[PDB]
């Protein structure tokens, strides 16, 4: 088993991986490593994809989505939540502190406040400017720690200029994220609507359950999506979707509909940016 | 065995008589499942669906629903207020917008924009019981039509006195409902948190993709949930989850955790209430 190991989506996953390796290289839990890792990006306003500098919906509202899942089937999710910069951490409080698994809208913000989170203005002057002119989709991270346990986190501000209330795949278990500790974990990126439609990351893990490698599982799930966009008469060039995956032995893999997605991998060989296979 | 309609719980007999009015005439499975569950959304005496549904703990009735047709088109609304017919606003999300899921206030603004009428959904019986408290959980329906197309719908008012903002499995396409026209369809009922945790209905259909009969697929998915509640130190007696399923040949099946769940089946032999096997 290659352990510990962290994978995350896109370029900024290199930096996010350096914060998760601070937990993982000291033998900490994968759950804490993935929360620390993506919170780095939630905190950054120059990151316009995720949390604090996130582009608003069409009414000028920054509403965020995130979920988390640990090594023992516990899950928490928040979607369309406002004024709280770290939605991954309110999702961990839903998991840990409530008999529920998903809170949305105003009820997710009331619970965040009840848990001590601070209400902040998430709309930067740059984002408000571009919104009124208009008038890296997410970060997913999955890790295997030194006890050989898996956990994952996915967080986003959604599609810029989305309709007020729109929820994508990032807060939905089995679409932006799925973790089964006797099999493997996977997270998704892309047009969320398409990951929800195919229930993406649950399909990738179940293909690893049926004996596939992580890269093979990612590839066949992308090929199933390619088949369905053809069935729906859609043009593939308009749609993008990538998956990254990890199994229990620390083997990892990725694949996407189209070229140009990349992911960051940090194990005891160091941290690097790799470029997956692509269908189109 | 077509056309054929299945729906959850004893009120599924009556809901099935409205879907057979479309199915028996050659109409579309999509229209049959929407007409079928709207019957129950309309009835004030049905306290877990639509009008008359028990409110969250703040006395707000917020509803969840999704729909999926024979070609991976999907629509969903969650935590929506003041609209009696959430399955129909979910069909408008699918048909009229670039998104597949709207929640909270944004789902209600879009409903109004599409001509739906704002109504007060808390009955005098539900407000009484809510203030007393202050001191069958959904309907899922799946059908195969005379063209041999599958479609499904699931709608609920959620767990009574749930935290404000809680969303169950009913509006989530990996979870309360999944339809793949080359394989089969399934809908779920029970404690929504547990169906979300296990991506219930996507797992049932993928087990039918692997060759399981509808009843076998439902049974093995319930047994996976039983394994996971044991892995989490929880008591099975505290949980009920059931699945009903249908494949492309119109074979059907169901299974649950505890006894006492039945479902309604209407094909050309007639409409009847059947009782599946249970795990506990």
Curated annotation (Swiss-Prot), chain A:
It catalyses: N(4)-(beta-N-acetyl-D-glucosaminyl)-L-asparagine + H2O = N-acetyl-beta-D-glucosaminylamine + L-aspartate + H(+). It is found in: Periplasm. InterPro entries: Ntn_hydrolases_N, Peptidase_T2, TAT_signal_bac_arc. GO terms for cellular component: cytoplasm; periplasmic space. The keyword Transport does not apply. Cleaved into an alpha and beta chain by autocatalysis; this activates the enzyme. The N-terminal residue of the beta subunit is responsible for the nucleophile hydrolase activity. It is an enzyme of class 3 (hydrolase). Keywords: Autocatalytic cleavage, Hydrolase, Periplasm, Protease, Signal. GO terms for biological process: proteolysis. The keyword Membrane does not apply. Pfam families: Asparaginase_2 (PF01112). Its EC number is 3.5.1.26. Substrate binds at residues 166-169, 189-192. The active site is at 138 (nucleophile). GO terms for molecular function: N4-(beta-N-acetylglucosaminyl)-L-asparaginase activity; peptidase activity. Heterotetramer of two alpha and two beta chains arranged as a dimer of alpha/beta heterodimers. NCBIfam families: TAT_signal_seq (TIGR01409). Belongs to the Ntn-hydrolase family. Cleaves the GlcNAc-Asn bond which joins oligosaccharides to the peptide of asparagine-linked glycoproteins. Requires that the glycosylated asparagine moiety is not substituted on its N-(R1) and C- (R2) terminus. This is N(4)-(Beta-N-acetylglucosaminyl)-L-asparaginase.
């Amino acid at each position: 088993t290659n352990k510990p190991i962290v994978l995350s989506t896109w370029n900024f996953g290199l930096h996010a991986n350096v914060e998760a390796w601070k937990v993982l290289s000291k033998g900490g839990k994968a759950l804490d490593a993935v929360e620390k890792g993506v919170r780095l990006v939630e905190d950054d306003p120059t990151e316009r994809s995720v949390g604090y500098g996130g582009r608003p919906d069409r009414d000028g509202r920054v509403t965020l989505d995130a979920c988390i899942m640990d090594e023992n089937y516990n899950i928490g999710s928040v979607a369309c939540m406002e004024h709280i910069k770290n939605p991954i951490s309110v999702a961990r409080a839903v998991m840990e502190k409530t008999p529920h698994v998903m809170l949305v809208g105003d009820g997710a913000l009331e619970f965040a406040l009840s848990q001590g989170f601070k209400k902040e203005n998430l709309l930067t002057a740059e984002s408000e400017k571009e919104w009124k002119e208009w008038l890296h989709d997410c970060i997913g991270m999955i890790a295997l720690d030194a006890q050989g346990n898996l956990s994952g986190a996915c967080t986003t501000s959604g599609m810029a200029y989305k309709m007020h209330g729109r929820v994508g795949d990032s807060p939905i278990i089995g679409a932006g994220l799925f973790v089964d500790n006797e099999i493997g974990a996977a997270t998704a990126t892309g047009h969320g609507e398409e990951v929800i439609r195919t229930v993406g990351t649950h399909l990738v893990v179940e293909l690893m359950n049926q004996g596939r490698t992580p890269q093979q599982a990612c590839k066949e799930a992308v090929e199933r999506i390619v088949k369905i966009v053809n069935r729906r008469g859609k043009n593939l060039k308009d749609i993008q979707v990538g998956f990254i995956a990890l199994n229990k032995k620390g083997e990892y893999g990725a694949y996407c509909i189209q070229d140009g997605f990349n992911f960051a991998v940090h194990d005891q060989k160091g941290n690097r940016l790799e470029t997956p296979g692509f269908a189109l």
